[PDB]
């Protein structure tokens, strides 16, 4: 409560609203991967579902997570789209 | 002729290939832990 | 860390008679180290030399009194009287004498006054002694190129390219002509015949290699100056490897690759030379059949040799002169005409010997 | 140092310092001979003596040098299996060049490259000469080296955890699982990944991983 010194959270693999619109339903795995760059978050053991994360806070003023995660069926086909902003 | 160095080998845990609830497997097999004389330590003598 | 192999000094000093120094007109340096032909020439008791920046003179061949001088250094532009680095020889042709800058800017010089007839850019610095071809001066630029200019204005008659080099073995091929057959040395041991009229390869030829991944003699300041006595030619190799060939052939008559030569002349039957060993070999016309060599000032850095009163002259880099009994075969006279020394052409026309020391402007001897 | 002498006596001195341990003078005379009679057959026997002492001398550069020289000299030789094990040994040695661990120190966290090299050598041994006179030694070096790399990566992840790059974290824990769910570092790390996800409301994976260490609560 007496430290103005804080950093900004230099983490990404973020999203563009372009990236947002970039993908629609049932779009296939390789297709979406190229269309959005490979992901880095996806369950070790569960389904083919995928995550995609935005991450920041500029220090003392609000933390901005923004992840969309991405469900996937058996045959590498999208099944559902799942965004989430901060909190 | 004893192994100059540890035998912390002997304190390494027998690696439990882990054991998870169903449908939760992970492709370990990238590794190379084949399981087959020669001492361990004292008589582990490297005279050729 | 400079253990260069110095040579024997002046041995067995001898002067059968009096090397009378006719005079020593030292008009003013000059060259410096700066190896370059720039050799001074004469015409009718009137002789001609030049500085290394644009100054040119015309003198008396009795005392070296100046008949007149001129400067040439460009009086404006990138330098007020820009050092123009005259490096062509001294080519005399009637009212017009010629000079070669190291800026590809020839200067035809109106002899009568020193009027700059015309300065013409060419394919590079004019290292070789420009040669007259009866309306055509023979400029052999640095970069293997070769161009003739109209004596009257410098019309570029043509632009024969030639024997393009890789590492510049000194490309002062002094071109020569035979009945209207333009000949010239080259930069890659390859003499080439040329149509005197408009520069067409009458034939080419290969004699020697040339320094750079195939290295040849680079202490033989080669007379890149094909002499042509009657149509059997005699060309010095770019490392003095002897040769003789039919004028309009290039087909070898014979060749003494033994030779690796600085400069040369020939008389009647005896050829002469300055091998890199810095020793002539009295050599008969037929083959490199030898009469004698003389390794006395072996490996001393020398000038061209020349004849005088039926005696052979030769200049050293240290103002010593080494008249040689032409048939046997060693010195006959000697004098330290300078400390400055020299390398360029000792000129002996009309029985008057001429030198420009590498800085010590013209000296002139007799006996 | 090298006094030239009868070669049989050269190898004699070599064996003298061998049974003793004066690796310096031994190696001197061995290299002397392979400057004197180098391409001879027992001169690669000399070379084996050389690699031997070079390790016994704890002189690892020339160890690698002569070992690889022996490999390029012979694809399979009488002592080449001992050579392979010695190569693995000198690599793992480089990984333990320092031995501060008994000054209350850890090495589970320094350069994990020679450990990869040794792990590879012992892999190539356990499936390339897997009947040698050096089976279980290499085997336990294998298992330990592996949990060692494990704890290394786990510490790295802990670092980032203290930093915040929870994604980097998750990926580390993952890549560890897919290199091992066995090595203690595994169970160690797991909560790392879990709190990480929690820093990301991906709580689904969090409680999944919870059940994971639950069935593996040991």
């Amino acid at each position: 409560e007496r430290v103005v010194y804080r950093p900004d959270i230099n983490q990404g693999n973020y999203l563009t609203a372009n990236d947002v619109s970039k993908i629609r339903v049932g779009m296939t795995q390789q297709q979406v991967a190229y269309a959005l760059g490979t992901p880095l978050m996806s369950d070790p053991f569960g389904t083919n579902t995928w995550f995609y994360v935005f991450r920041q806070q500029p220090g003392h003023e609000g933390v901005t997570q923004q992840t969309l995660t991405l469900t996937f069926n058996s045959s590498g086909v999208l099944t559902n789209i799942d965004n989430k902003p901060a909190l | 002729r004893q192994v100059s160095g540890d035998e912390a080998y002997l304190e390494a845990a027998p690696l439990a290939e882990l054991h998870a609830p169903a449908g939760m497997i992970l492709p370990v097999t990238s590794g190379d832990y084949a399981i087959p004389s020669g001492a361990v330590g004292k008589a582990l003598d490297i005279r050729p | 860390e400079e253990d260069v192999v110095k040579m024997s000094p002046l041995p067995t000093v001898e002067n059968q008679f009096t090397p009378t120094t006719a005079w020593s007109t030292s008009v003013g340096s000059g060259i410096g180290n700066f190896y370059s032909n720039l050799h001074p020439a004469l015409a009718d008791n009137v002789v001609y030399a030049a500085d290394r920046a644009g100054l040119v003179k015309a003198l008396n061949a009795d005392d070296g009194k100046e008949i007149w001088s001129v400067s040439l250094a460009e009086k404006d532009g990138w330098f007020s009287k820009e050092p123009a680095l005259l490096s062509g020889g001294v080519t005399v042709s009637g009212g017009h004498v010629y000079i070669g800058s190291e800026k590809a800017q020839v200067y035809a010089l109106n002899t009568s006054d020193g009027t700059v007839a015309w300065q013409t850019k060419v394919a590079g610095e004019a290292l070789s002694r420009p040669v007259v071809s009866d309306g055509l001066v023979l400029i052999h630029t640095s970069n293997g190129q070769l161009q003739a200019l109209n004596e009257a204005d410098g019309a570029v008659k043509w632009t024969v390219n030639l024997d393009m080099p890789s590492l510049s073995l000194r490309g002062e091929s002094a071109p020569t002509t035979a009945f209207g057959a333009a000949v010239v040395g080259g930069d890659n041991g390859r003499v080439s015949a040329v149509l005197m009229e408009q520069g067409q390869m009458i034939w080419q030829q290969r004699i020697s290699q040339a320094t750079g991944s195939t290295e040849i003699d680079r202490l033989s300041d080669v007379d890149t100056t094909p002499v042509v006595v009657n149509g059997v030619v005699f060309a010095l190799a770019y490392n003095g490897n002897l040769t003789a060939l039919d004028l309009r052939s290039g087909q070898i008559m014979w060749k003494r690759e033994l030779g690796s030569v600085n400069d040369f002349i020939v008389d009647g039957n005896r050829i002469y030379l300055v091998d890199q060993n810095d020793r002539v070999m009295a050599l008969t016309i037929d083959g490199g059949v030898t009469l004698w060599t003389q390794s006395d000032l072996l490996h001393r850095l020398l000038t061209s040799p020349v004849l005088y009163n039926g005696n052979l002259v030769v200049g050293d880099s240290e103002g010593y002169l080494h008249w040689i009994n032409v048939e046997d075969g060693r010195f006959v006279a000697q004098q330290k005409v300078d400390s400055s020394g020299f390398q360029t052409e000792p000129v002996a026309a009309d029985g008057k010997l001429l030198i420009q020391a590498k800085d010590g402007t013209v000296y002139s001897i007799t006996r | 140092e090298v006094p030239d002498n009868p070669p049989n006596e050269i190898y004699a001195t070599a064996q003298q310092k061998l049974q003793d341990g004066n690796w310096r003078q031994a190696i001197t005379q061995l290299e002397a001979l392979d400057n004197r009679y180098p391409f001879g057959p027992y001169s690669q026997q000399v070379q084996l003596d050389l690699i031997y002492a070079y390790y016994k001398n704890a002189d690892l550069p020339l160890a690698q040098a002569a070992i690889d020289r022996f490999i390029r000299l012979n694809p399979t030789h009488p002592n080449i299996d001992y050579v392979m094990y010695m190569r693995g040994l000198t690599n793992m040695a480089l990984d333990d060049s320092a031995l501060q661990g008994f000054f209350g120190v850890d090495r589970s966290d320094r350069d994990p490259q020679h450990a990869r090299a040794a792990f590879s050598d012992f892999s190539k041994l356990v499936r390339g000469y897997p009947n040698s006179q050096y089976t279980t030694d290499a085997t336990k070096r294998l298992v330990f080296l592996k949990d060692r790399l494990a704890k290394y990566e786990y510490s790295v992840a802990e670092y980032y955890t203290e930093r915040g790059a929870w994604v980097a974290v998750v990926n580390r824990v993952e890549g560890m699982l897919r290199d091992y769910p066995d090595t203690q570092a595994t169970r160690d790390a797991l909560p790392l990944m879990e709190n990480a996800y929690r820093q990301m409301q991906m709580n689904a994976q969090a409680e999944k991983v919870a059940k994971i260490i639950a069935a593996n609560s040991s």
């Binding site: 760059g37 490979t38 | - | 400079e2 990138w78 202490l219 | 400057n35």
Partner: protein, 710 residues
């Protein structure tokens, strides 16, 4: 059997790396254990004189010594009949028609003006240096507007002595044009406006090729912010020779983003990967902007716990996003133990040693231990630094030091100030080079029976005490709760031997009550590097400190905090701390201790009539001057020519008393000692020392022109 090649003995090179010629020998199929080819005497002689021709000599023959030996072993000597290397005499720039040729050398790497008035390398030759000069000239026109410019050819001649190189240039001087406009083209991926602004040329201005390339690669970096590894972008000019202008095609094309997965480091065995991985402000698991990688690199550099920050990105094979970073780190290790000893008569030669491990185990923990000594005033020092106390980077440095001198010369009373103390430093990196700090400095001192000296006694009354004047009896113990601060902005290159950058060491020291000696003050250090040689081998070496004392409550600089200079780095050539106010004692007699008329510093044993004394004690204010030019020793090392100058003085030196005695309130008393910032390397470590010319010696200064260690 002709074999075997067994002997290789390079002799007469005297100028090169013999093993380079050895790799050539192998490149000629020649080395120990090879097929002994008696024939190859002349062959390899040719090859290696050709090597000389390569290195720019062509003037060093060689003689090989075949030595028939028994069946296997052979001998061979290689007599390098060396001479004088090739030498450059002059350049020509043909076709030059817009600028002075010699000016168009005035940027050339290679040269011919190295005479005894101008120094530029030497007139040897290597075609590579040539090509550099070529492109230099090429730029030299392309910046100007000379589009069509080129280099028609070049060549280099040999004076027919193998001595003289000639230099020739064949140009076509471009015929300047006024570049018209630029056209972005291709993948900008929603980053247009910015890029367009990265190229806001002046309308139709002159052509300037390097300015273009700047626009180009700055657009590159610009994108790198948005994470594109190799934003393959091309700049193309389209010539309008008709109007004499040219238009510009900016072929833009980016890459992809979320790149960095697993950042290897290397060779850090001595050093905890944790700290290294902290010295990279690019948090992993994210995209890449190579400038982040660099700023990292520089951080690692400033740490100094390294030797080479070599980076290498790596597109991991398998998907364009798989991109990961190695760090080939070849950091050196130093056990920093150096004992510099000062010699210079009998009552003042000791000096001090550093016994410091320099981050034990590379844990990220430098920890200090230092000791010093003087006739009586003997001080030690000890420390422990936590560069990374918190995740952010907070540096925490413990400090400890001991004066343990009760003045045991006779028994005591000979300036007894056994005086220890300790403190910590809660150092912040306030900004990415800005750093104020903080700490709670504390120190015990005990004075007793000191030989009386005007300074000390003015102090005691500044203390507000009434010590019996001409008496070796009075005692004073003291401690202090001191509040600390201080500032430092380092953007230097390499923390051990630098090349360039800002070094400042503001150390704000004050005190607070509850303590004994109430006073305030502040110091600050000034020092920096910056190169003169732009090969980053000659460098200007700034250095200067500014001494200042003071005291709250009208009190005075508690004189255990008296600054000093003289001896080592502070000054050169002088003896230790022998610069500034040399104290003076009252015409004192009553010492309570009369030796056999020993201890002649104003005691009863004679010693009346105030002894204007030559005992350097220094005072509340100081500055020493030090500006230096590295010569990367052309004979870890750097060599300049020290000439430095310093001065010390007391403010409160009220000349009223000192009237007839050399004033010590006059700061303008600057000494000077000249020499050369020497440093060597022998097979033992980072060897370095100094030796100065103490000319501008003031009244009674005391010099030992030598110095040892660093």
């Amino acid at each position: 059997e002709r074999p075997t090649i067994a002997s290789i003995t390079f002799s007469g090179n005297k100028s090169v790396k013999d093993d380079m010629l050895k790799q050539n020998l192998e490149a000629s199929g020649v080395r120990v254990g090879e097929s002994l080819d008696r024939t190859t005497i002349a062959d390899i002689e040719k090859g290696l004189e050709d090597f000389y021709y390569s290195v720019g000599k062509y003037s060093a023959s060689v003689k090989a010594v075949v030595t028939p030996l028994p069946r296997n072993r052979v001998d061979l000597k290689l007599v390098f009949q060396e001479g004088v290397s090739a030498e450059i005499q002059q350049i020509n720039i043909v076709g030059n028609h817009a600028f002075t040729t010699d000016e168009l050398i005035s940027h050339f790497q290679l040269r011919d003006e190295v005479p005894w008035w101008n120094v530029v390398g030497d007139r040897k030759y290597q075609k590579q240096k040539l090509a550099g000069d070529l492109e230099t000239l090429r730029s030299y026109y392309l910046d100007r507007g000379y589009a069509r410019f080129n280099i028609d050819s070049t060549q280099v001649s040999l004076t027919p002595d193998k001595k003289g190189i000639y230099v020739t240039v064949n140009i076509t001087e471009g015929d300047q044009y006024k570049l018209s406009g630029v056209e972005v083209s291709g993948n900008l991926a929603g980053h247009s406006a910015e890029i367009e602004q990265l190229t806001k040329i002046e309308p139709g201005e002159l052509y300037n090729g390097t300015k273009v390339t700047k626009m180009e690669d700055d657009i590159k970096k610009l994108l790198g912010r948005y994470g594109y590894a190799y934003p393959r972008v091309q700049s193309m000019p389209e010539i309008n020779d008709a109007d004499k202008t040219v238009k510009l095609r900016v072929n833009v094309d980016a890459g992809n983003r979320f790149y960095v997965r697993k950042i290897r480091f290397e060779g850090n065995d001595t050093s905890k990967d944790a700290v290294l991985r902290r010295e990279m402000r690019q948090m992993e698991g994210a995209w890449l902007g190579s400038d982040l990688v660099d700023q990292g690199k520089e951080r690692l550099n400033r740490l100094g716990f390294f030797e080479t920050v070599d980076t290498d990105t790596q597109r991991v094979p398998g998907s364009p996003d798989q991109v990961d970073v190695v760090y080939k780190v070849k950091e050196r290790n130093t056990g920093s133990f150096n004992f510099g000893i000062g010699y210079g008569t009998e009552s003042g030669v000791s000096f001090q040693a550093g016994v410091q491990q320099d981050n034990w185990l590379g844990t990220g923990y430098a920890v200090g231990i230092n000791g010093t000594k003087n006739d009586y005033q003997t001080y030690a020092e000890l420390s422990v630094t936590n560069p990374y106390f918190t995740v952010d980077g907070v540096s925490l440095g413990g400090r400890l030091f001991y004066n343990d001198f009760q003045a045991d010369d006779a028994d005591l009373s000979d300036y007894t100030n056994k005086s220890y103390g300790t403190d910590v430093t809660l150092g912040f990196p306030i900004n990415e080079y800005n750093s104020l700090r903080a700490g709670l400095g504390y120190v015990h001192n005990s004075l007793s029976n000191m030989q009386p000296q005007v300074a000390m006694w003015r102090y005691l009354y500044s203390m507000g005490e009434h010590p019996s004047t001409s008496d070796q009896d009075n005692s004073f113990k003291t401690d202090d709760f001191t509040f600390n601060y201080g500032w430092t902005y380092n953007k230097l290159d390499r923390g051990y031997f630098p090349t360039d950058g800002s070094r400042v060491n503001l150390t704000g020291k004050v005190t607070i009550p509850g303590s004994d000696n109430e006073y305030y003050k502040v110091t600050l250090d000034t020092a920096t590097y910056v190169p003169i040689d732009d090969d980053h081998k000659w460098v200007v070496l700034g250095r200067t400190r500014w001494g200042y004392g003071d005291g709250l409550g009208g009190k005075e600089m508690p004189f255990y905090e008296n600054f000093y200079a003289g001896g080592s780095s502070t000054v050169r050539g002088f003896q230790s701390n022998t610069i500034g106010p040399k104290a003076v004692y009252f015409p004192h007699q009553a010492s309570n201790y009369d030796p056999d008329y020993d201890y002649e510093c104003a005691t009863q044993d004679g010693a009346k009539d105030l002894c204007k004394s030559d005992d350097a004690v220094g005072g509340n204010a100081m500055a020493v001057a030090s500006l230096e030019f590295i010569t990367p020793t052309p004979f870890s090392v750097r060599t300049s020519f020290f000439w430095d100058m310093g001065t010390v003085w007391d403010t409160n030196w009220d000349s009223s008393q000192y009237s007839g005695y050399p004033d010590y309130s006059d700061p303008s008393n600057i000494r000077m000692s000249a020499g050369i910032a020497l440093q060597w390397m022998s097979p033992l470590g980072p060897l370095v020392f100094s030796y100065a010319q103490p000319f501008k010696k003031y009244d009674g200064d005391k010099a030992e022109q030598f110095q040892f260690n660093i």
